[PDB]
Structure 1
Amino acid sequence: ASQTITVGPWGGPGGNGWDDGSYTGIRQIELSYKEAIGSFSVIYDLNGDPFSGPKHTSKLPYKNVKIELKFPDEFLESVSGYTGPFSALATPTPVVRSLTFKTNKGRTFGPYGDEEGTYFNLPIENGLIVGFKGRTGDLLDAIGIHMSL
């Protein structure tokens, strides 16, 4: 097995751990949100063809959003968000409350969720996010990234 620089998890130890692994790039990101981030799944690029990563779906009735990147001219240049406990859960471990994505083309996708708690910011000067890692219970407990050149 090859390996990739893996950075992060930002968030808490709750939920179940998952790792989608590494691919060639990112085409589309799908997440649900309200006061925190619920569902999270992505459509990766695998050597030129779209490839659906495993779904990390949340049952909560949250609003869905689809982030379509203009692969391969456009790619994530930074990932940022907020982690903190959430009040509505039984629950006391930190969870990803908010997520914000910035592109090399200057596009910004939201702040989805409540911008409340402790802040995390991953600005990328050189390199590509090539896969996601994280934890999901009823919501998105933690998020992590795999990177390559």
Structure 2
Amino acid sequence: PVKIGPWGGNGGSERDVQPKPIRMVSMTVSSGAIVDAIAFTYVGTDNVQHSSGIKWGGTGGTEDTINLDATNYVTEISGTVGKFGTDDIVTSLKIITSKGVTRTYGSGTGIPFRVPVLDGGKIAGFFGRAGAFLDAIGFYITP
């Protein structure tokens, strides 16, 4: 995959997956006022299915899961980076799939970021930073 990002603040602890993802199977976002945590399931470059492990971020918010397949894949993610308390974090995220559904996580504000993937490309997974919340998010993308 291509690896781009992340978007967000410098706090929390680094997060990534080994091996790198080639296809995302599911993703789970934990959120409330802002984005608390993220987790996902993927097929790696080893052609095996993996978990990203325990979620990246705290125990706050509520979980929501998106299940992906050959015709239902993530084509756009956008969001905002702003304060929640003293830290710059991911204060909102919006996920758009190839079947035209939008999910929105968080209700926060700040500086917008947007990654529209065109021509059949798709988000294959995530990396970033997280502590109590999701400080920063980055993407693995396949054409």
- Equivalence for 1:129: 123
Q: Structure 2 CA distance, aligned partners of 1:5 and 1:45? A: 15
- Matching residue within 10, 14, 35 for 1:13: 10
SS at match of 2:38: strand
- Matching residue within 69, 73, 76 for 1:75: 73
SS at match of 1:130: strand
Q: CA deviation at 1:58?
A: 3.3
Q: Structure 2 CA distance, aligned partners of 1:41 and 1:139? A: 13
Q: Structure 2 CA distance, aligned partners of 1:19 and 1:61? A: 21
Please tell me the residue identity of whatever aligns with 1:12. G
Aligned residues between the structures: 140
Please tell me the residue identity of whatever aligns with 2:39. S
- Matching residue within 101, 105, 112 for 1:107: 101
SS at match of 1:61: coil
8 Å CA contact retained: 1:18, 1:134: yes
Identity over aligned residues, as a percent?
29
Q: Structure 1 CA distance, aligned partners of 2:56 and 2:35? A: 10
Q: Does 1:36 align with 2:30?
A: no
Q: CA deviation at 1:57?
A: 4.0
CA RMSD of aligned residues (A): 1.8
Q: Structure 2 CA distance, aligned partners of 1:125 and 1:57? A: 27
Q: Which has the larger radius of gyration?
A: 1
Q: Structure 2 CA distance, aligned partners of 1:24 and 1:57? A: 20
Q: Structure 2 CA distance, aligned partners of 1:45 and 1:143? A: 19
- Equivalence for 2:113: 120
Unaligned runs of 5+ in 2: none
Unaligned runs of 5+ in 1: none
C-alpha offsets along residues 104-134 of structure 1, whole Å, 9 cap, x if unaligned?
Answer: 111112x111241111111011322222110
Q: CA deviation at 1:49?
A: 5.8
8 Å CA contact retained: 2:13, 2:130: yes
Q: Structure 2 CA distance, aligned partners of 1:57 and 1:11? A: 14
Q: Structure 1 CA distance, aligned partners of 2:138 and 2:82? A: 16
